Amino acid sequence: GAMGSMERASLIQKAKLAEQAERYEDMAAFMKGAVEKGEELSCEERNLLSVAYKNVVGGQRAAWRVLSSIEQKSNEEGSEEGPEVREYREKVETELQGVCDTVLGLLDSHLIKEAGDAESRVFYLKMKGDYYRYLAEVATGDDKKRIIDSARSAYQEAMDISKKEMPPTNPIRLGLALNFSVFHYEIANSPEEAISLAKTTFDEAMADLHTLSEDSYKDSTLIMQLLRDNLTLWT
Amino acid sequence: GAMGSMERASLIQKAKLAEQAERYEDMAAFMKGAVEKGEELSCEERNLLSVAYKNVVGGQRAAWRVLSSIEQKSNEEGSEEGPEVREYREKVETELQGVCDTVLGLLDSHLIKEAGDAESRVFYLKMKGDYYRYLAEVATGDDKKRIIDSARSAYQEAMDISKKEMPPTNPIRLGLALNFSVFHYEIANSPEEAISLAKTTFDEAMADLHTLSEDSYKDSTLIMQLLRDNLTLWT
Amino acid sequence: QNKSM
Amino acid sequence: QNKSM
């Protein structure tokens, strides 16, 4: 590994620096090296990892969607014919799949099996689900169903742990629920399940708000607002 | 070259696709391959090249400035001490210098010597000046003066050709003047020259506007507005 | 645009 | 922010 000669703490520091500079590819490389040091990650470190790879793969997904729309247009009725569009969409798609495989390899070697506390275990299983979902977004062949089911399984195990070990307003539980609802709506062709999950999540969080101190849950009300945005869009 | 096996036209097409997807690193690689095919570039192709490398190196410059400000803060009075900040700023800086060297190598091999028309010759000399200026922005050692003078020389040769072969409202001449004024203000420590150049450029373009058709100079009024922004900031 | 986090 | 193009 290119980072095997840098101190873990130095990798964390440089990941924060890269975050400040919005150099998310560097951030991802640094946090990958940190993970490969072999020690479990603190709450702050998991956040850095997730943020870095989320931004990298988000850019990749947006580019893939631009190119896929162009490709679809190029295969309509009356559209003038070469292979360039397909080739470049395949290039972006292959790079995207590489990043997703890298993150899943990190989770499987060996973040999840050493994750014993609810916070971290749910975090990692949500991330596994997220990246299998990103793989599902572009899958078209004999593996689509298995990729979708891997995403579902990871999300479901995370849900079972969060419901049992976390309060309804925990930001991790809320983000997991948001993304699992988006899985149901956009991947699993199950919009009614997506709506039901979003509504139940929002209602339970709403009912638990009264136990929280004010300045200590900005992210939770933020994510409840995202749940409400999705509900407004879908109904 | 990784692109030596792709058709020139395919490289151009994929550069446009990458522009649409805002994948500017891919755009730069494609236009580099196109250039290395050995044929001169059309007006539309030069634009693709310049846009791609401008966006790549602009991201690099913004990151370098974030990191350099952090570095400066870390060397103030009462600031707590490691080498990580310096190291990562050096990493971004070295990558930036690599991109600048690549563009200058393209211009020198062999775009400029084959550029015989005013439009293309001025375009390429402006770009040479721009990338030597980007190198100057980060230079600190025994080469700073020579880098600054290379930028000045390229800009000045482009200016002499544009004044003699182009009308005052030509977008290329106006952009050259804008960037040469910014060179004077920010690199050459010559703010009075920068202001004089900006004002004279704007006034001559203003006086020549009456010769143009309306929908055919959006870029020229845009660049005149940028000249006025700089004048407002500097005075 | 589905909201995710 | 100096304007360049």
Ligand SMILES: C=CC(C)(C)OC[C@H]1O[C@H](O[C@@H]2C3=C([C@H](C)COC(C)=O)C[C@H](O)[C@]3(C)/C=C3/[C@@H](COC)CC[C@H]3[C@@H](C)[C@H]2O)[C@H](O)[C@@H](OC(C)=O)[C@@H]1O
């Ligand atoms: C600045 C450094 C980092 C840590 C990278 O990002 C800061 C953010 O990191 C934390 O927020 C997390 C978190 C985000 C919050 C929802 C953002 O909240 C606000 C108001 O900005 C977005 C991030 O992507 C992050 C790290 C992602 C996770 C997500 C990961 O799934 C695998 C699940 C839900 C969410 C949880 C972990 C959030 O708690 C903090 O609790 C937030 O503190 C505040 C001000 O609300 C801070 O915004």
Ligand SMILES: C=CC(C)(C)OC[C@H]1O[C@H](O[C@@H]2C3=C([C@H](C)COC(C)=O)C[C@H](O)[C@]3(C)/C=C3/[C@@H](COC)CC[C@H]3[C@@H](C)[C@H]2O)[C@H](O)[C@@H](OC(C)=O)[C@@H]1O
């Ligand atoms: C969409 C494809 C490309 C070609 C990449 O970009 C489009 C743009 O490309 C051309 O514009 C050029 C040009 C830009 C214009 C100033 C933008 O104008 C508007 C209203 O958007 C910005 C670009 O960076 C570009 C290509 C850069 C150059 C610059 C290069 O120096 C080495 C010198 C000045 C400027 C000249 C070449 C401009 O003419 C066209 O004349 C513009 O046509 C319109 C609508 O104004 C179009 O915006």
Ligand SMILES: [Cl-]
């Ligand atoms: Cl390709």
Ligand SMILES: [Cl-]
């Ligand atoms: Cl580094």
Ligand SMILES: [Mg+2]
């Ligand atoms: Mg494929």
Ligand SMILES: [Mg+2]
């Ligand atoms: Mg608990």
Ligand SMILES: [Mg+2]
């Ligand atoms: Mg250096």
Ligand SMILES: [Mg+2]
């Ligand atoms: Mg002429």
